[PDB]
Amino acid sequence: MKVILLEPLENLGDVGQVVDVKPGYARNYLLPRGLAVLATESNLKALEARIRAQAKRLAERKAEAERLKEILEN
RNA sequence: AAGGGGACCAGCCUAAACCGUCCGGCUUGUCCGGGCGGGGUCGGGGGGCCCUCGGACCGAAUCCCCAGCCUAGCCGAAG
């Protein structure tokens, strides 16, 4: 089924990406070896929490920047 | 079996959303989930979260106290 990959993974995807596999792969390879995690509501969120948080931390980074763009070059 | 006639008669608590707290996980975070707490219980669909308005009567299957009752008994007419 669906999993959230914790690492980069050959022909599946980049970390954090959500890909769809056969459950045998997931349960006997991916999950045990901390390579991916099941795509449950409960960590489908932790995907987006990490996302939102990432977006905002960059937002301030382009904020206190825009300060240092008008206050500088001036 | 529905139905009709009867017996008895009684209706409730949660899960979830939302809020709070404590605890532990690592990826700190508007995170995730574990407990406890609040909130909620319905088929005129009900509940949550917001806006306005409103403004003591119920009531236990729980806890008391009592009557009554069971576990000995007693009085009891007239040759």
Please tell me about this protein's structure.
The structure is cut from a larger assembly and holds one chain. The chain has 74 residues and is of the alpha+beta class. 49% of the residues lie in helices and 14% in strands. The longest helix has 21 residues. The protein is elongated, with a radius of gyration of 18 Å. The structure holds one RNA strand of 79 nucleotides. This is Large ribosomal subunit protein bL9. Part of the 50S ribosomal subunit. Binds to the 23S rRNA. Extends more that 50 Angstroms beyond the surface of the 70S ribosome.
Task: Give the tags.
1 chains; 74 residues; alpha+beta; 3-stranded antiparallel sheet; 3 helices; 14% strand; elongated; RNA-binding; rRNA-binding; structural constituent of ribosome; ribonucleoprotein; rRNA binding
The biggest beta sheet reads: 3 strands, antiparallel
SSE pattern: EEHEHH
Rg calculated over all Cα atoms? 18 Å
Task: Give the strand order, joined by hyphens, for the main sheet.
Answer: 2-1-3
Helix tally equals 3
Q: Can you give the helix content as a percent range? A: 40-55%
Based on CA inertia axes, which overall geometry fits? elongated
N/C terminus separation = 56 Å
Portion in beta strands: 5-15%
Strand-pairing-aware structural class: alpha+beta
Family: Belongs to the bacterial ribosomal protein bL9 family.
Function: Binds to the 23S rRNA. Extends more that 50 Angstroms beyond the surface of the 70S ribosome.
Protein name: Large ribosomal subunit protein bL9
Organism: Thermus thermophilus (strain ATCC 27634 / DSM 579 / HB8)
